[PDB]
Amino acid sequence: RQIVVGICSMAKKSKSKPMKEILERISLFKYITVVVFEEEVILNEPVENWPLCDCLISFHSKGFPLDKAVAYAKLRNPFVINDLNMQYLIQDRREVYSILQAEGILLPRYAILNRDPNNPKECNLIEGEDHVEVNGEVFQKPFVEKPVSAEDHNVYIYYPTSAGGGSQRLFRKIGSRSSVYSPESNVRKTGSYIYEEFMPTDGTDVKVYTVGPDYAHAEARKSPALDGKVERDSEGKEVRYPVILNAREKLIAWKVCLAFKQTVCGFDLLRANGQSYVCDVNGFSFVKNSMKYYDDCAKILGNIVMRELAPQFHIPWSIPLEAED
Ligand SMILES: O=C(CP(=O)(O)O)O[C@@H]1[C@@H](OP(=O)(O)O)[C@H](OP(=O)(O)O)[C@H](OP(=O)(O)O)[C@H](OP(=O)(O)O)[C@H]1OP(=O)(O)O
Ligand SMILES: Nc1ncnc2c1ncn2[C@@H]1O[C@H](COP(=O)(O)OP(=O)(O)NP(=O)(O)O)[C@@H](O)[C@H]1O
Ligand SMILES: [Mg+2]
Numbered sequence: 001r002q003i004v005v006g007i008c009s010m011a012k013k014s015k016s017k018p019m020k021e022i023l024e025r026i027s028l029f030k031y032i033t034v035v036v037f038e039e040e041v042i043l044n045e046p047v048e049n050w051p052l053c054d055c056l057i058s059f060h061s062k063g064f065p066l067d068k069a070v071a072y073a074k075l076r077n078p079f080v081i082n083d084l085n086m087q088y089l090i091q092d093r094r095e096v097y098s099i100l101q102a103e104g105i106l107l108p109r110y111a112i113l114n115r116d117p118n119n120p121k122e123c124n125l126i127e128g129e130d131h132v133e134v135n136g137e138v139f140q141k142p143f144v145e146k147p148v149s150a151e152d153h154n155v156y157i158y159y160p161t162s163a164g165g166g167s168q169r170l171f172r173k174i175g176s177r178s179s180v181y182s183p184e185s186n187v188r189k190t191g192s193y194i195y196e197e198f199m200p201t202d203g204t205d206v207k208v209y210t211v212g213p214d215y216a217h218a219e220a221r222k223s224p225a226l227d228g229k230v231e232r233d234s235e236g237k238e239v240r241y242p243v244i245l246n247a248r249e250k251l252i253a254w255k256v257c258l259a260f261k262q263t264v265c266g267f268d269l270l271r272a273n274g275q276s277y278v279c280d281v282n283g284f285s286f287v288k289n290s291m292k293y294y295d296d297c298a299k300i301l302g303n304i305v306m307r308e309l310a311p312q313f314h315i316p317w318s319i320p321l322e323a324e325d
């Protein structure tokens with residue numbers, strides 16, 4: 001019989017252009033059949049009724065029942081490409097930074113302010129005009145304030161008096177904008193936040209996309225922290241700049257991929273002070289608008305599948321050579 005690769009995610013994701021491009025390519029593997037789980041089934045049917053697969057590619061996004069995906073994997077025991085339990089932790093920035101620290105990965109100096117919604121002022125924060133103190137730890141402006149939920153993209157940056165004060169409020173892109181300036185100089189007074197040192201970059205963020213630990217595509221984009229106008233090309237796509245990762249950064253990608261057990265993994269790097277700091281780990285993420293990535297990603301995932309399962313299915317398989325970039 002064919003090896004079945006099951007795709008389990010919200011329709012918005014499973015039906016996206018990158019997914020469709022990759023799935024048609026994986027389907028070219030002679031011994032692999034692709035089955036995309038319908039959203040109505042994922043949301044409404046018990047896991048006992050979900051289709052069978054031998055290899056499961058499943059990932060959480062807004063609205064996805066991760067509890068069900070976990071239960072399905074427990075029931076059927078398929079080969080899992082992106083670890084499901086780690087996807088709970090990826091939703092919590094505190095858990096993400098904790099794992100990065102444990103792996104010896106450079107990240108901005110940070111402190112967590114956990115606030116009890118019942119006693120919002122009993123928390124360990126002291127505010128000055130040009131600094132905050134979080135559990136005793138001082139952060140001079142400029143500093144970054146992030147919601148503990150990784151799914152809340154309302155990240156704020158606070159500027160020093162020497163720069164005009166105020167704050168930059170970041171958010172999920174709306175049309176042509178990704179952030180806006182506010183005259184507000186005081187930090188948010190409700191919610192729990194991570195406070196971290198602002199890393200001076202050249203004005204771009206490096207986005208890294210892994211396919212297993214030995215492949216990473218990188219590209220750069222204007223930092224939303226800069227002014228908030230999104231740069232677009234003549235076709236309306238966000239402008240992307242070429243990046244090649246150095247040896248240190250290739251090791252970062254290897255470490256992130258394995259530490260979070262996400263074969264397909266996106267994360268963000270800040271090139272600052274001669275080093276590269278991880279500021280965000282997003283989990284499952286494809287490169288968009290790159291035919292070469294489509295080819296490479298599909299080939300690598302197909303090969304991972306065959307490597308793991310070909311012996312079980314008595315299929316001859318000789319492990320092939322793959323790109324790293
Ligand atoms: O903003 C956009 C619109 P686009 O810029 O014109 O594509 O697309 C964004 C998606 O928004 P939704 O289209 O509503 O799902 C978002 O999904 P979410 O987190 O569930 O909101 C992520 O996509 P993914 O799941 O990781 O692949 C972002 O990638 P990231 O995690 O590296 O930041 C995308 O940004 P990038 O495309 O510019 O890289
Ligand atoms: N410590 C820092 N120093 C300097 N810039 C930062 C820092 N942290 C975040 N930024 C900038 O602010 C942006 C948003 O922060 P990030 O932690 O990526 O939030 P997010 O909401 O998870 N974005 P996404 O990549 O869509 O999930 C980053 O792309 C950086 O440009
Ligand atoms: Mg096939």
Ligand SMILES: [Mg+2]
Pocket residue numbers: 268280
């Ligand atoms: Mg980010």
Ligand SMILES: [Mg+2]
Pocket residue numbers: 150280281282
């Ligand atoms: Mg993120």
Ligand SMILES: [Mg+2]
Pocket residue numbers: 060061282283284
């Ligand atoms: Mg995501």
